Amino acid sequence: GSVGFSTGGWEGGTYFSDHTVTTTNTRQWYTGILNGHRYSKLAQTTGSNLQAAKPWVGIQTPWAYLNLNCYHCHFSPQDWQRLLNEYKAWRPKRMHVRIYNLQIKQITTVGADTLYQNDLTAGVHIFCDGSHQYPYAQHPWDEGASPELPNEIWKLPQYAYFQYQGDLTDHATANTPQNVESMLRSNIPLFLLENSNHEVLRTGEMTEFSFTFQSGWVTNDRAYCCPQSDFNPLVQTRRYYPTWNGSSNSYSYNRYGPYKKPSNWMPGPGLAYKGATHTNQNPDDARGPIVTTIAPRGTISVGSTPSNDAPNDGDNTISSDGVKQGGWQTAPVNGACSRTDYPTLAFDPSDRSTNQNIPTRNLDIDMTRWYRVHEPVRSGNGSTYYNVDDVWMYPNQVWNSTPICRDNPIWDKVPRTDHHTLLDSSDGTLPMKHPPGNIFIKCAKIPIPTSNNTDSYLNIYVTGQVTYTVEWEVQRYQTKNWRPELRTSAGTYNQHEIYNIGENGTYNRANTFNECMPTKCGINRVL
Amino acid sequence: GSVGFSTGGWEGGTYFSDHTVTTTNTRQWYTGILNGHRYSKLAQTTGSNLQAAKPWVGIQTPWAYLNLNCYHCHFSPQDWQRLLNEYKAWRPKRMHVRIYNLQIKQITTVGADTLYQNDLTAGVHIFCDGSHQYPYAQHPWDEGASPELPNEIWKLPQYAYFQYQGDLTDHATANTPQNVESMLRSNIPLFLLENSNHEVLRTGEMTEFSFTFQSGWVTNDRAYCCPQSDFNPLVQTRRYYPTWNGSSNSYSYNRYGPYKKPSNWMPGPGLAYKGATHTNQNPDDARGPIVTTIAPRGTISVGSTPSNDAPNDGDNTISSDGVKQGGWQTAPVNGACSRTDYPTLAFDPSDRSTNQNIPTRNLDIDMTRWYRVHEPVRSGNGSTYYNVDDVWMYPNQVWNSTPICRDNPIWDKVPRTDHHTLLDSSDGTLPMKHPPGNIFIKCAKIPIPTSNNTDSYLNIYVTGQVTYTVEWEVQRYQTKNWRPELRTSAGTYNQHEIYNIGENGTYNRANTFNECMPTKCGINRVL
Amino acid sequence: TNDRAYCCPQSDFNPLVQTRRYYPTWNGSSNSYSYNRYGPYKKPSNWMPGPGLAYKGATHTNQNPDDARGPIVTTIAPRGTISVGSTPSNDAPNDGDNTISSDGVKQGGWQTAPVNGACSRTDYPTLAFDPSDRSTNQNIPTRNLDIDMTRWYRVHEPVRSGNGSTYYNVDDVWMYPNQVWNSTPICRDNPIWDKVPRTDHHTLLD
Amino acid sequence: YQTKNWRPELRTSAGTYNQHEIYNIGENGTYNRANTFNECMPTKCGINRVL
Amino acid sequence: LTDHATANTPQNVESMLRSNIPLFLLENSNHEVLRTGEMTEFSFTFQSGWVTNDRAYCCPQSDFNPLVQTRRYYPTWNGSSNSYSYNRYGPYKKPSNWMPGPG
Amino acid sequence: GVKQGGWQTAPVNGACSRTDYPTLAFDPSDRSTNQNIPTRNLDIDMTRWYRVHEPVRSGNGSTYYNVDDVWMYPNQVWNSTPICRDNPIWDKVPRTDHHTLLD
C-alpha cells in the first residue's frame, strides 16, 4: 500500500576523487497533457513567402521527454570550478535515472475555482527508447533541459520530430527521373510511440534507467605553444629554403634561421566563415556558415530554377532566398580556427533568459588553434600572401578542440550513416554513437464518456521527482611547470554576485562566456 | 497500507535515577510553505540612515527547522525542581528525535470557505545536517523552540542564514590592498539545501535521528566561601606584608593578620561593562558590552574614516553611529563578575510573551563570583584603590559559572575556528563542538501546470508529531553539612499560581529570574 | 589552515526568528533599568572577539635597526642589576624599582613582533619581509590582505556617559573565555615552524 | 576541502597579479619574486568554511 | 603578442597569456648523478608505422586491362537539347575509383 | 606581419611529386662547408602525382583547371615521399585533442 509510502528520497551532491567524479541531482518535474493527447502535423509557417511550402514539416506528439544534456544540469558552479581547477580531462561514463514520488492530479473546475485532486488510479506512460527506434530529435542546445537550480520546477518539453521537407516539388526534365517528389512523399515515416513497449505507473510506483557512455574526452588543459614554434633555437637546422632566381631560372638555398624552423605539423582544419550576418530578420532563415540544400534529382526546391549554361548543365541553381529559407545550416564550423570562435557560438546560459547580455565565445588562449593561415606565392618581384579561409583536412594536422563552459551541452548524437569523418565538434560537445536514449513521459489518456463519439479526456497532469546520477571518469593534471597558472576564480568576474540568489529569488547568471567558466584556460600541457 | 496505520504513539514523562535522568517529550508540529518555496535575499532595513547598506545581508530559505535547545522543552517545572533539588550536576548525553504521524493537507478555496483535505501522495522533505555542512544559524536564545506545554502546537521556525556584511565598501589608500570589497563579495557562499541528500516522507512514513553529546557539566552546587577567605585563623601565617618607608626608601615587614591570609587564587576573569544603556531606541543597534567591528583592510565600514594622526596612522576610526549599527555585539560578558550579572542577561521565559515583567538575572549567591576587584597602589601618603572593571585571564584564576534557570538554552555551538580560549559562557549554555544538527523540514513543492512558465505550486502544509528524548547524565550531591540548605520550593514565589493553567487556558510563567528556578541556589560544595 | 570564515561568529544567527533576550536601558529618573527585546538583526553573541593587541611599535624613525621598536618590548634584568638607561625611582608606584628611559628601553629591550593576534587592523604593517635573502627589490611584501571574517578590525566597550554613551576603542584584548578566532593568513615565503622555548609554562600557542 | 557552497570561490591564480612574469626567469637569469604579499600567494583567501 | 581591446574582443587576454607561461627547471625532477666509475643505461620501445622502400611502377588509375571493354559510359552535353548523350569509355582510359592523394 | 610573426610548415607537398622540389633541401651533416646542397628532386614512385586537373565544360570546349590544393578526400591512395640516409628517423606527434592521418 504505497499510496502513503514514498518511492524515494531526495538525492543531491557531488563527490570528487582521483579517477571519478559523481554528480547526483534531483528535480521536481511535471507535465500536463500535450497536444490534446494526439499526434498532429507540425509545419513551420515562417519565412518569406515563396511559391512553395515551408521546409520543415513534422509530427508533434502527445509525449514529453527528459533532457539531461548540459553541464549545469549535473554540476553546480562550485563543482564546475573544482572540476576545471583540479582535472585536465573528464568524460561521462554511466548515468542512472530514477523517476519516483509520482503524483497524478485531476484538474477540475467546480466553479470560479480550479481544484487539484489526486486521481490515485491514473497512470503515467514512461518509455525509454534506448535502441533509438524513434527519432532522437534532440538538438544539444535546446531549452527544456533539467534546470540548473535544484529547487526549480522542471516542465517537461514536448516531443516532436521532422518528417519531410515541404518545399520539395516534382521537377521533370530530360535530366531527371520521373515522379521523385511523390516518391519522397510516399516514403515518409510516421512514428507513434504507442506501438512500442513502455511502463505505466501509478502513484505508488517508480522506474529507473541506466546508461553507459562511450565517448572521447573533454580536455581541460591547454597548449601554451603551437607545434610549429616548439623547436630549439640554440641548435642550427640542416634544412635550407629555396630562393628563385629569375635570371638563371633556378633555385639557390639558404639555411633556415634557427628561430623559425620549418615544421612537419599543419594547422588544424578550419573553416573561417561567419555565415550571413547582414540582417537580424527572419530567425528561421539559414544564415550559415555552411548551408546545405537537400533535394533529390527529380525534385525542385524553393527558389530553384534549372540552369542549362555551364557548369550547371541542367542542374538547378538556387537563389539567395531559396538557399536562405530552404537550406539547413551547420554552425559553428570554425574547427581549429580561433579567429572564428567569435561570433559563431553564442547562447543563453539558461532557458527563457531575460538577460540582454548574451554570452558568446570570445576567449580561446590555446595556442594550437590558429588565427590566420597564409599560403605565400611568389608573384612578380615579391610574394603574395594568400589568406586561407578554408583549411580542409590534410595529413599531419594537429589541433586542440574549442574550450567549453558549464553552459554547454555535454554530448551530441552522431547521426547513423554509412560514413563519417573524424568526430570533433566546433561547439565542443562529445559526439556519441548511442547517447542516452530519450526518456518519454506522458499522462495516461483517460476518456470521458461521450454519446457523439467526440474525443473527450479527463484533464490531468503528473508531477514527480527525477534523480539523475552521472559517474564521470576524470584525470588529475600533473605538471613540472615551475610557475603558478591561471585558475578559475570567482574574483575574475565583473559580476561579483554571479551564481548568487538575489532579491525576490532572482538567480544571477553569466553575462559573458568567461563568467560561464570556460575550460582550457588554466592548465598547461607539454606538447 | 499505513494510510490507516499510525507510525507512532504519544511519548511523555521523565525518569529519574542516580546516574541518569531521561526526559521524553512529544509535540504536535506543523509548517506551511515558507517564502513561496524559494530562496531569496534577506536584508535588514532598520537602523539610522547612513551612506551605506545595512550590515546584515543573507538568505532566507523555504525550509523550516527543529529547535530543541532550551530546558523547558525537556523538563516540566516539577521535573526541573526535582533535578535542582536532588542533583549537583547534569549534562546531556544522547538525544533521540522521532518524526511521525505525518499529515499533509491541501489548503483549498472552493468559495467563501477554506477546505483542508489530505493529499495522500504529497511528501515532506526532512533533512538532518549532522556534519554541519550548512550554516547552523541557531542563536541559543531564539524563539521557535519546542513549546513548554506538551499540548501546545509548535509552528516550525523558518531557516535563514547570514551571507555577507552589506555595509562594507571598497577603500583604496596607500595603506590598503586593492579591490578587497569586490574580493569579499565575490567569495560569499550560497547554500541550497537541495544539493544534499534528504528523506521525502508520505503520510504513512516516519523518520528518526540520534545524537550523542560531548559537553562539560552544568553544575547545581554553589560555593559558600571564596577561595580567598578559606583559611584557618587559629594558625598564624609565616607570611609578611611590606610597608614602604619614604624616609629610608625601603620596606619593612609585618606578619599578615590571621584573619586575612594572602591567597594564591585570583578572582576569575570578568569584564564589568553594561554596554550602551542610554537609550531604548533602535533594537538593531549593537549596544554591548563588547562590540566587534569586522572589516578587512581595503574595505571601509559604516561611519568609518581613515585617520592619519597617531596612534591610528592610516587606520579607519569609526564613529559612534558606525560602531553602533555596524558592529556585532557579545553579551553577556560578565564572566566571573557577579556585579554585572545584572542587568546583562534578561529574557522572556517563552516566545511571544505578553508579560510586562521581564525575568533578568539578579540572583547569584555563589561566593566564588566577585563583586568588585581592586588594585591598591601606594599614592602619596595613603594608597589609591583602583577598581578593576576588566579582569582578563590570568594564571590561578578559579571561579564558578553563572547560575542558569529552566528557561535558559542548553547548549551553544562553538564556532569552528583555528583557536579558542577556555570555553565558559557568561549566559550559562554548554559550549559544544558538534551540537545536535539542524533537522530541516519543508513541504514538498508540488507544481501547478502553467502555460506562461510562472511558478505556481499547490498550497499544502504538513503537520506531525515529534518525540524527542534526552538522556541526561546526572550526579546526586553528597554532603557532610550538618544544617539544612536552601531548596527550590514553590512557596518561595510571589506568584503562587505560577506554572498553573488559569482562566481560558492562560498558562502562568515566571515574572522574575527566581521564579524561573535558577541553579546554584541550594547545594553547598566544599572548596 | 587554508579555509577562511565568511562570517564572524557574532553575525551568524537567523533574523527570521525573534530572540527571547532583552537589553537594558537605564532610566536616570527612576534609577533603574527597563528592557526591550534585541532586534532580530543583531542578536547578542556568546562569543568574544579573539585576543588581539593592536600596537604598531615605535614607527617614528627608521634609524638604528638594532633598536627594539615594538610592539611589545621586554626588558630583562634581575633585581640587583641595572640595565641601560635605568635609574632607581623612589617615588610611587615604583618604590625602589628602576625606571627605564626611552633610550634604555629602546636599545636594552627585546622586541616581540607581530603581536596582532586576532586583530586584523594591525596585520599591517606589523609583518613585512623579503621573499628571498639579499633582495634588491625595493618593493617589500607586507601583510595587508586578510579577508577572514573572524578576525576583528576594532573592538569597542560602550559605557553610558551622561546623556549618551562613550564608545571606547579597545586596543588590548587579552585572553578571555569564549574567545574564538582564526589565525593570520600565511604565504609561501613564511617560515613553517617556530621552536617553542622550553619553559615551565606557556599559554595557548598561536 | 569539501563544501556545499553553491557558488564558485576565490582561488589562487596567476592572473591576479600585477606582475605577470612573476616566478619566471628573465634576462640573464634574473628570477622574478613577489612585490606584494598577495603575489606571495597567501592562504585563507579562497575556501569558505562553515562556522 | 600585445593586448588588443575592442568591442569584438574580451579584456586582458595578453596579460592572461603572459601570466600563464610555463617555466621548466630540470632540477625539480629526479635524475642520476654519476662519478667517473659509474655508468647508466636507457631502453626505449618504438611504436611507429613503416618506412617503405618499394615503389609503385604504375598509378592506380592506369592499372586496368585494355583488352576488356568497360561497361561504363561518359556523358557529353548537347547544348541544343540541353541533355546528355553517352559513349563507352575507351578501353585505354578506364575511369578509376581512386583519387590522387592529398597534396 | 605574416612574414616575421607566423610559424611555417614545410614541406607540405604530400602526395604531389611536382613540389617535392625544391621544398626539401638539407645539408647531409652539421656545419657543412659544401656549396652543393642536396635537395629532393628524385621521386620515381608512380602513385605520386605531378598535376591534378578538374576540367569544366566552358562555352564550346572545356577549361582544364590546375588544382594546386588537393585536400583529403575519400578514396585517396598514395605513397609517401622517398627518404635518404640523411633524413631524420622520427618526429614527435604533438600531444593534442585531435590529429588527422599521420603522413
Author numbering:
A (entry chain A), B (entry chain E): 41 to 567
C (entry chain F): 259 to 464
D (entry chain F): 517 to 567
E (entry chain G): 208 to 310
F (entry chain G): 362 to 464
Original paper wording:
To expand the structural repertoire of determined capsid structures for the diverse Bocaparvovirus genus, viruses infecting dogs (CnMV), pigs (PBoV1), and rats (RBoV) were selected. The ORFs of these viruses coding for the major capsid protein VP2 were cloned into the pFastBac1 plasmid to enable the production of the virus-like particles (VLPs), using the Bac-to-Bac expression system in insect Sf9 cells. In the icosahedral capsid, the 60 VPs assemble via two-, three-, and fivefold symmetry-related VP interactions, resulting in pores at the fivefold symmetry axes, protrusions surrounding the threefold axes, and depressions at the twofold axes.
The first porcine bocavirus (PBoV) was identified in Swedish pigs in 2009. PBoV is usually associated with diarrhea and upper respiratory tract infections in piglets, but a case study in 2016 associated PBoV with a case of encephalomyelitis in a 6-week-old piglet in Germany. In the case of PBoV1 and RBoV, the cryo-EM maps for the most part also showed densities for the carbonyl groups of the main-chain and densities for a specific rotamer for the individual amino acids, guiding the model building for these viruses. Capsid structures previously determined for the Bocaparvovirus genus showed disperse protrusions surrounding the threefold axis that do not significantly extend radially from the capsid surface. In PBoV1 and RBoV, the shorter VR-III does not cover the entire twofold region, but their loop also advances the twofold axis and restricts the size of the depression. This density was also seen for CnMV, but is absent in the PBoV1 and RBoV capsids.
